[PDB]
């Protein structure tokens, strides 16, 4: 794509890259384990749009945060289970987790991490029985990101197109 980017485009790329990112991370994980696995390869799957430059973004992010994720993933679900959030306070809780994480600051590593645990927390409720949490989580993420000045940060770092300019690029 082209250089530069505004919060407007950042939001769209965020949701897209978010779904694709979590999709890849969990995709490769399905081989090793099945923790918080998706709804099987079907219509309920995560039909991402890898045809765009964003497609490569999620993949890369999953790599730089692959070991890190799985590393603190086992424990992530452990404590997450002790939470047991709801669809009413879903955002009330999520917003807290992120705010507490990015509280120290904002960095490429923090962004990827947010999504890593994001999908987990989402599926946690979805599989629990609250069918239809994917959209809720995604919406809260994009809204929280564009509210926590996150979008602006990403745009300054070179939008989501900067992922290819990272470690494994």
């Amino acid at each position: 794509a082209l250089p530069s980017a505004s919060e407007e485009q950042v939001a769209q790329d965020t949701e897209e890259v978010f779904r694709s990112y979590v999709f890849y991370r969990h995709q490769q994980e399905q081989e090793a384990e099945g923790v918080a696995a998706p709804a099987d390869p079907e219509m309920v799957t995560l039909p991402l749009q890898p045809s765009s430059t964003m497609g490569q973004v999620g993949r890369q992010l999953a790599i730089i945060g692959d070991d890190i994720n799985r590393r603190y993933d086992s424990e992530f679900q452990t404590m997450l289970q002790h939470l047991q959030p709801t669809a009413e306070n879903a955002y009330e809780y999520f917003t807290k987790i992120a705010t507490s994480l990015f509280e120290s600051g904002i960095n490429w590593g923090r962004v990827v991490a947010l999504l890593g645990f994001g999908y987990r927390l989402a599926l946690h409720v979805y599989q629990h029985g609250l069918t239809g949490f994917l959209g809720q989580v995604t919406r809260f993420v994009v809204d929280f990101m564009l509210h926590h000045c996150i979008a602006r940060w990403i745009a300054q770092r070179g939008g989501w197109v900067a992922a290819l300019n990272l470690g494994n690029g």
Binding site: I68, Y72, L83, L101, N107, G109, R110
Partner: peptide
């Protein structure tokens, strides 16, 4: 309660270390 601070204190650990491993 203990989870409210724990769930946040546990993420002391996913934000940083990737940025340095990239």
């Amino acid at each position: 309660e203990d989870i409210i601070r724990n769930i946040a204190r546990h993420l002391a650990l996913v934000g940083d270390l990737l940025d340095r491993s990239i």
